[model samples]
Target: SCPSVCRCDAGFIYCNDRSLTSIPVGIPEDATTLYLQNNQINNVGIPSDLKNLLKVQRIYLYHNSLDEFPTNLPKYVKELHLQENNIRTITYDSLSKIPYLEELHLDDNSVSAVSIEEGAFRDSNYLRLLFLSRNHLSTIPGGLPRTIEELRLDDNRISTISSPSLHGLTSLKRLVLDGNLLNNHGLGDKVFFNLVNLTELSLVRNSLTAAPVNLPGTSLRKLYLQDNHINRVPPNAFSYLRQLYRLDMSNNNLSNLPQGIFDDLDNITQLILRNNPWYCGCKMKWVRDWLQSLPVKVNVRGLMCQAPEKVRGMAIKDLSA
Candidate 1:
């Protein structure tokens, strides 16, 4: 029911998902959060007075026509979801105001370049969890916040990333770079050098023709390397990751898994080896024994050889002898 004062419930506003074209007036000034998403509001209709809601913790303005971020958010707003918009560029100026901001979701937008003009987000101390997937970001700027814990830059046009661009981000644990134009040579050898805390890394559907160079000597647990041009995994490439548990190498062109590639990874538990061309020769003999002997579970239920028609649909154990 519409209240006489036009104010909604506490910390919850339903101006969202409606036919409204603008941010309506008379919102509860004491509201600690607002949901104005799935509306027809454009940039001009975003009220400049929203900054007055100093205690607001989250704001959802997604599915709007806001190409660039509207300024003057509440200083205390922590999470902002602005996905499914036509945003093209993201500069520090667009985000520097929110000092206590923690999570920002700008996914499924048209973002291209991340401009890093000086003094951008300079005082944002609590910033974390940035989602920029499904954008047009060709090159990630070196000016991103180092305090971020999880960064989702997947489904972009980025072809490469350098070590210097990822330095000082010691707190980062998960990085998603799937569905891009990245190749093995573009993502350099030293790119994963200092990211000791990275636990989950995804490189699915990239243009990589080979597995990435040696990973860092860290506690990496899950690795997603599906849907690429990888034909051979170098020997002992993952030996440094002593604690790696899950490895997804499915949907690639791997003709053979090198001997001892999983040598030092004693703690690996789940190995995904589906959707690849496998030979039925002696090269696959160890696979049968290893699949049965290893304590880890191989998630290849119906994986069969694309070659050697006589070995089709045969279990990996039958390939022995």
Candidate 2:
């Protein structure tokens, strides 16, 4: 027996946007996917709500006002979308219930605190993608499952990243920490030491005054550091990132780059170096010549000289070699 408002098709139930205030009864016991998004349902985990449906795999409950995590969820649920809700805290017990959960989306919520007790995700090895973007987290949560591949923490208030905070995430590939309060000193030399499988890493719009020295991992392909306070980059800052292809260093306080900085980046294809305060003079001759010899496409647009009044408005690429 299915609820009158719910439409069932191919073992999927669609009960979205029905202005329902609570979980409707009589849902198909064999439903595999359930869509209850865009509703006014403020209460969940009733006595018998979602107790059956043992074969359910995915559940969409986004755009709701759930202040607490739902209970009685099927253990086989793989993907759960609870974004755009009022959930302020995520405890280990709430998530550990679903051992096989793979993807969990809690983005655009009021989640400011997340507590994961020891061995919380030990049994949930299949969980991979965890989205916590657009929240109020001030620090990176610890005890994350080691099986995570892509972790998004953008648009949060996180200020520092300690090595221990990311201890077991060795399988991480793509990590996004944009729009945080990170600085060069806040990231330890071994901060990313264990992420051997990392490929794409972004720290855009942070408080970094310079690129973190001793960036671990050599498999990085893309690096983003735009809109920071970086005034200089170490000579060997990107030496380990030999496989890097796309790099963004725009909108910073850089007035000059170290000599032969781009010599080793043979694999680099796209380099963004605009919106920086570059001083054009005899010292810039090397940079101008280097840009011309680069086989890669370097974006020099908006790269104007701010010093040497004679060439005040000249582009960095136009400087005499």
Question: Which candidate wins on lDDT?
Answer: 2
Error of model 1, residue 172, in angstroms: 0.6
TM-score of 1: 0.90
lDDT of each: 0.75, 0.78
Specify the highest-TM-score model's number. 2
lDDT of 1 by residue, 1-321 (tens): 333422467667667666666676456667766888888777777677767777688888889978677676677878888899887656666577676888889888877654334445445768779898998887666666778889898889998776667777788899999889999888866777677888889999999998876687575899899888897777756777778878888888876666666677767767777888777777656767766676445444435666678877677665655
Over 4 Å off in model 2, which ranges? 43-49, 114-119, 296-302
Residue range 1-321, candidate 2, lDDT tens digits:
777877789888888978878777677667788888999877453436565668889999899968877766776888999999887756667777777888989888776644334555566789799898998886776667788999999998887676777876778998999998888877666767678889999998999988876665378888999899998888888776678888898889989776777677767878787788787766557777776675445444556888877778777665665
Q: Ten-residue segment with the worst summed lDDT in candidate 1?
A: 1-10
Clashing pairs in 2: none
Number of colliding residue pairs in each model:
0, 0
Model 2: worst 10 consecutive residues (lDDT sum): 113-122
lDDT of 2 at 9: 91
